[PDB]
Design an enzyme around this catalytic site. Sequence first.
Site, PDB file in Angstrom:
ATOM      1  N   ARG A  75       0.933  -1.009  -0.256  1.00  0.00           N
ATOM      2  CA  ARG A  75      -0.268  -0.328   0.141  1.00  0.00           C
ATOM      3  C   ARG A  75       1.058   1.338  -0.500  1.00  0.00           C
ATOM      4  N   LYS A  89       3.489  -8.248   4.035  1.00  0.00           N
ATOM      5  CA  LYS A  89       2.596  -8.547   5.146  1.00  0.00           C
ATOM      6  C   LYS A  89       0.942  -9.439   5.154  1.00  0.00           C
ATOM      7  CE  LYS A  89       4.370  -8.153   9.610  1.00  0.00           C
ATOM      8  NZ  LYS A  89       3.940  -7.963  11.072  1.00  0.00           N
ATOM      9  N   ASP A 104       7.949 -11.168   6.393  1.00  0.00           N
ATOM     10  CA  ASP A 104       8.058 -10.198   6.566  1.00  0.00           C
ATOM     11  C   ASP A 104       9.467 -10.047   6.946  1.00  0.00           C
ATOM     12  OD1 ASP A 104       8.888  -9.288   9.453  1.00  0.00           O
ATOM     13  OD2 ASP A 104       7.509 -10.172  10.636  1.00  0.00           O
ATOM     14  N   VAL A 105      10.337  -9.219   6.424  1.00  0.00           N
ATOM     15  CA  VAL A 105      11.188  -8.430   6.141  1.00  0.00           C
ATOM     16  C   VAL A 105      11.716  -9.387   7.780  1.00  0.00           C
ATOM     17  CG1 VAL A 105      11.470  -7.357   4.105  1.00  0.00           C
ATOM     18  CG2 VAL A 105      11.311  -6.375   6.279  1.00  0.00           C
ATOM     19  N   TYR A 135      12.237   6.964  15.020  1.00  0.00           N
ATOM     20  CA  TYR A 135      11.961   6.921  13.406  1.00  0.00           C
ATOM     21  C   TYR A 135      13.328   7.742  12.698  1.00  0.00           C
ATOM     22  CZ  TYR A 135      10.271   7.746   9.285  1.00  0.00           C
ATOM     23  OH  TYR A 135       9.789   7.183   7.455  1.00  0.00           O
ATOM     24  N   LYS A 138      16.097   6.320   9.911  1.00  0.00           N
ATOM     25  CA  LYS A 138      16.137   6.755   8.462  1.00  0.00           C
ATOM     26  C   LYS A 138      17.794   6.916   8.264  1.00  0.00           C
ATOM     27  CE  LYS A 138      12.165   5.476   6.538  1.00  0.00           C
ATOM     28  NZ  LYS A 138      12.358   4.358   6.132  1.00  0.00           N
ATOM     29  N   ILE A 171       4.662  12.770   1.442  1.00  0.00           N
ATOM     30  CA  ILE A 171       3.527  12.032   0.318  1.00  0.00           C
ATOM     31  C   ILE A 171       2.264  11.612   0.911  1.00  0.00           C
ATOM     32  CG2 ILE A 171       3.382   9.878  -0.776  1.00  0.00           C
ATOM     33  CD1 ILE A 171       5.810  12.186  -1.345  1.00  0.00           C
ATOM     34  N   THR A 215      -1.243   9.524   1.816  1.00  0.00           N
ATOM     35  CA  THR A 215      -0.954   8.022   1.727  1.00  0.00           C
ATOM     36  C   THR A 215      -1.763   7.589   2.926  1.00  0.00           C
ATOM     37  OG1 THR A 215       0.171   7.470   3.119  1.00  0.00           O
ATOM     38  CG2 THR A 215       1.258   7.314   0.932  1.00  0.00           C
TER      39      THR A 215
END
EC number: 1.1.1.122
Lengths: 257, 259, 258, 259
Positions: D16, D38, D59-60, D151, D155, D184, D186
């Site tokens: 998504r 997932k 699932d990484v 977060y 990154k 962005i 979403t």
Amino acid sequence: GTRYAGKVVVVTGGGRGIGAGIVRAFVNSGARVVICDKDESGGRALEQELPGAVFILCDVTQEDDVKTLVSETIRRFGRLDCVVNNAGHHPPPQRPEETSAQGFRQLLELNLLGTYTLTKLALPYLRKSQGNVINISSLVGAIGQAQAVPYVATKGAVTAMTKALALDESPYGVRVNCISPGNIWTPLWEELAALMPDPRASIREGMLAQPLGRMGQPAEVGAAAVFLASEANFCTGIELLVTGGAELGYKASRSTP
Amino acid sequence: ATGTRYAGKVVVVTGGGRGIGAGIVRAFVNSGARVVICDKDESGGRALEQELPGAVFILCDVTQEDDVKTLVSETIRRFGRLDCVVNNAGHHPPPQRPEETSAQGFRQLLELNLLGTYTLTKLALPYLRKSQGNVINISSLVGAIGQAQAVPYVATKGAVTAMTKALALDESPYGVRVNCISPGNIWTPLWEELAALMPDPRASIREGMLAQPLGRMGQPAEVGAAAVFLASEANFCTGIELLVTGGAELGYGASRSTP
Amino acid sequence: GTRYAGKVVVVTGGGRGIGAGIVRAFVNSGARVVICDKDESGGRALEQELPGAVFILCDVTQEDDVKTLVSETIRRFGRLDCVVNNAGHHPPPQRPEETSAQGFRQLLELNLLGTYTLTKLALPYLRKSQGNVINISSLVGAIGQAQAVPYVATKGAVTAMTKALALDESPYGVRVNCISPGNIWTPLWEELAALMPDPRASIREGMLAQPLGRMGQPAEVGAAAVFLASEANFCTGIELLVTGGAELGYGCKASRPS
Amino acid sequence: GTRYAGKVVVVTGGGRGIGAGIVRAFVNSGARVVICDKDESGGRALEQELPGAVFILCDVTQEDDVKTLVSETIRRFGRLDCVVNNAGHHPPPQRPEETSAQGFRQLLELNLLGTYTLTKLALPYLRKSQGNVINISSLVGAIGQAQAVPYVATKGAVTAMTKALALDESPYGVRVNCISPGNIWTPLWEELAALMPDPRASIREGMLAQPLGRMGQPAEVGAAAVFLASEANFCTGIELLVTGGAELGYGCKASRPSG
């Protein structure tokens, strides 16, 4: 010196090398400096040399150690003005295939989460003193290095986290900055150079790795830290490069042969 | 067969007669655009016209305001629109230590490398607003990290990259994007001729290839592809510096925290 | 009092604002400071206020003024340890259409070529003393600013030129660095705000452009300069941001979803 | 497609939002796209809609999942040309005191170590194809953000790790780049705004954080990724900003002159 007289500084990873240069610079500016390190040999030697330094055997990856570090600093000295997060390890050269997720996690614990934990626990006291945080990152966090994927990642995280923390603590007047060293001479570097096939050539190559034509000294990192703590009252979220110009086009242009 | 990624659009490329500029011209022509070459390099510009029906050459010196006025006039008169201006005009002097440079030479270099870009962009903006077009300035990696023996050149390219960001802010309310490309070491026929005159051409060529992690020099076509991207597909990018350097700015060639 | 004792420092544009804060910081560090500026009254007044400081009526866009500045400094002291290139002008807000090539050229003369000319003439003496150059640039050279195309371009040039000079002069041990101030409260800032439709609101916007919620002081730029001159001995080609965090995080960049 | 026809692309977090925009962009360029995401992610619906997309429940953070992802991609398609590491989570706004070391570790697992594991396992195949890696980072890794210490740190790590990997894999001709999106629009953005007392006001603030006056689209990140994969052949170790200019100029960074 008196630029930081009456102030109390905690330096993690302060037992030798860059960290000890930071400790020495702060003691010479009049501060009381608490060394938090697992390097007892170096921390005790530094304490022996410098009356203003106090050594506490302290592992920043252990939350109980960090809690005790802060409460003892406040109990003994009544205030906390500056936290310098220099704890961290650089593994030997390792290609991506020679690293493991488990090793990467261990390196994040020491190089990133130790800084996070101490900073969080120190913030109530730094707010009271309008103190500041200095994180020691690395030029390789900004431009990369080969054979060091985990280390580079941890230092990119430290520099970014510095900026996030600077934003979060700005309403309280608590500045959060980082220093990014390049190639800094240490006694370890000197010992390793002596075992190279051609020590003279290895030493010269290290000196010529940056435009200034010499390696940096721990005292120079230390002076940058004292500046950020004591005189940089409008600086927050900056990355202060102490690299001798290594990031410059030295990378020299070959737009002509 | 002509591509369609920028079909029906009109592009001006200053310094488009050869080298990097010609790679940008060719990339836009192959994407379906009509490309106007503004250059004093008639030899290169006429050769490009012969190769590329979609390009047109105008003898044009961006340091002369009347030339720039004629360039824009004529582009609009003939083609009715202007969608993208690529400011590639610019000169790199030979190596010069600071004491070997002059204020007069520096001023001349600012005229060509910076103020020509300023003049054309200003005159083009009314038409770019109409088309919701964009500006692409070709700067250089050396504007960002420096180079030795090039104080005037480095200063001019630092100015171009900064001006790109200022213009992006000023033109953002009109939907006109302004971006720059910073090439590193790009191969040209001139580079290859100069390497052949070095004391050891093989060593000089190898040194040039190894000056960036990718182990080769860049190609004009690669700068051109980056420009077509910025013009045609980068609709949320403005004020960026797109590095086309093969990694030259990275910690390559490198930490010496251990001997 | 002794961090830079006995060292000879030239400050262009040192008569007021940021420049005067730099002058005062160097005098307080024990240095001997030569003030180069066009403001006779303010220059003479600083000279009167700061014992040991020297004022020279001096326009860096005039090559004869620059030659006299260097020659009389060397004649007076026999040495030159630091040049701080702070001369420069910020125009009022101007949209691109409201600028001219001639105005742009004159701003390049003031903001860039004066720094170039003085640095070139000073470098022989700086090599002798292993001295250093500090250029005062601006944050807006790095991140842009609205309504300031010429100014932004000149400061992008200064910052880049700093790095080029650092590469050229590192073989001689001469460091070349720059300071990029953000919003520094000065009479010039106040004069620019007075031109705005609502000066009080403009000043408040200027204060809130920094996460710290205030503007900087000339003394803070001055302390950064003393650091670069006296204690930043492994720094060359750096851009030292004195901005209060203005470049950090998201903020309001457009006026009244994808 | 045909800009990336015949190629095979893996997109983690492709179900998504930004990830789905990247999937669609690569399918539209002619690539076969393998989505690692997932169960509740959107990836299964993308496979339903797009004949060129394959969904693998994955699932990484689970090494066995990543091993199966790579081995099934090679078993089915015989090659791997591009890995896009978009898996990651943005927590709700949290002051430093609202975060925990445990939460920080969990976020590093998803946002950083999954990218590490997949990239390592993919590299033998990327070397064979002279393929490339694209990491999706964030503008906030470069300039910080309020109320997001974990977060932002993750990154910043991704962007730096991109440069380290570029240096390690350049000897094999494998480019490694990152894209740093800003705001962005979403469902994730909309969900975070809905947490706020005045969602409409938070959205308007989000739009006005860019000089362009709008947020970006997943399709615009996707177009940047297709460029990096297919046309940026002299780019490695770059950070491609897709931010609408949010990093440019002065803006509002505090709430209610030099102290």
